Amino acid sequence: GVTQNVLYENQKQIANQFNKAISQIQESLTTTSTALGKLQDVVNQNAQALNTLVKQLSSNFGAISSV
Amino acid sequence: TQNVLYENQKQIANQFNKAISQIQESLTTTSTALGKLQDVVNQNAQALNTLVKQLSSNFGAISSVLNDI
Amino acid sequence: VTQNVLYENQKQIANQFNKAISQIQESLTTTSTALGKLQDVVNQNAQALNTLVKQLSSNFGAISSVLNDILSRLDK
Amino acid sequence: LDQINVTFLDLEYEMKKLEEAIKKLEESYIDLK
Amino acid sequence: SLDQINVTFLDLEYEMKKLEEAIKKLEESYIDLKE
Amino acid sequence: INVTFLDLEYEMKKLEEAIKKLEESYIDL
To answer: How far apart are CA D15 and CA A46, in angstroms?
Structure first.
């Protein structure tokens, strides 16, 4: 009877703590995918800027060389 | 009562083990993405260093021609 | 007996849970650390690129104007 | 200098896999009697 | 001219804060089983 | 001009470890 009560109370704690942890894990995974998104956007943007710089560099180097 | 407690423990274990399986997949995914990010970042870092190399080379080559003229 | 089995199972559940939570926290600390590093390297190389564009425009302006004044001075 | 080329990044798959993970964690939840 | 080349910067401080919060709230989720 | 390189191999190792230690945390009821 008393033991039954203790086990029930422990299960209450286990469920509450578990569900709480799961809620936090989900938010942290949302945060992680958000950051990955941002990182990707900035990396690819600066990749593009670098390709475009190389393009305009070759064009100006060729224009100055021909002169 | 014994039956109810047993059934609740079954749920707790199944749900826990399921969540753990998903967490492992998501951590594998996260390390994979980090790997990719690193590879692309370092590749473009190398392209930038190499561009600076070839820039100094061409700048020095055109400067020395301009100076001797 | 039945009470013994339920007790043993709860002990396992708690230990395994708390262990998993400890590992999850370490992995989230690791993840934020990596994000920090990624940010630092990305922004550093972004700066290096802006600075390269600055010194590039300065040298392009300095060299591509010498050729034009030579276009005028080779006609004299 | 055309031999200097840069690379691009696509993690869409990874991000989809995370969105999946978070949705399947909703499923794992606990409701006792 | 080359002013059309623009470089961007990254700020994921909010994201890292949200992770630090998550970890701190997982500390509140441990199980102190009353023996 | 200074460019820098990234090395998060330690971090990825630590994640692989985490995943492997989560395999030890399942519940055999």
So the answer is: 21
Rounded Cα gap, residues B37 and A41, in angstroms: 11
What determination technique applies here?
A: X-ray
Tokens of C1: 């007996």
Q: Which of C4, B38, C27 is nearest to A29 (CA)?
A: C27
Structure tokens given for A2: 């008393």
Give which of C69, A66, A4 is closest to B4, Cα–Cα. Answer: A4
Give residues 36 to 55 of B whose Cβ lies within 8 Å of C.
37-38, 41, 44-45, 48, 51-52, 55
d(CA E31, CA E28): 9
- Report the chain C residue with the minimal C-alpha distance to residue A47: C46
> Taking Cα atoms as reference points, which of B15, E17, E32 lies closest to residue A10?
E32
Resolution in angstroms comes to 3.3
Q: How far apart (Å, rounded) are the C-alpha atoms in residues A60 and A52?
A: 12
Closest Cα partner for A61 from C31, B61, D7?
A: B61
Give CA–CA dist A31/D27, Å, rounded: 19
Exposed e or buried b for every residue in B13-46, given b needs 16+ CB within 10 A? bebbbebbbbbbbbbebbbbbbebbbebbbbbbe
Q: How far apart are CA F25 and CA A21, in angstroms?
A: 15
**Domain map of chain D by residue range?**
1-28
Q: Do the chains contact at E9 and C60, CB–CB below 8 Å?
A: no
Mutate to test the interface with B, among F19, F24, F25 (most CBs of B within 10 A): F19
Looking up tokens 């690791």, which residue turns up? C30
Q: Cα separation of A21 and B15, whole Å?
A: 13
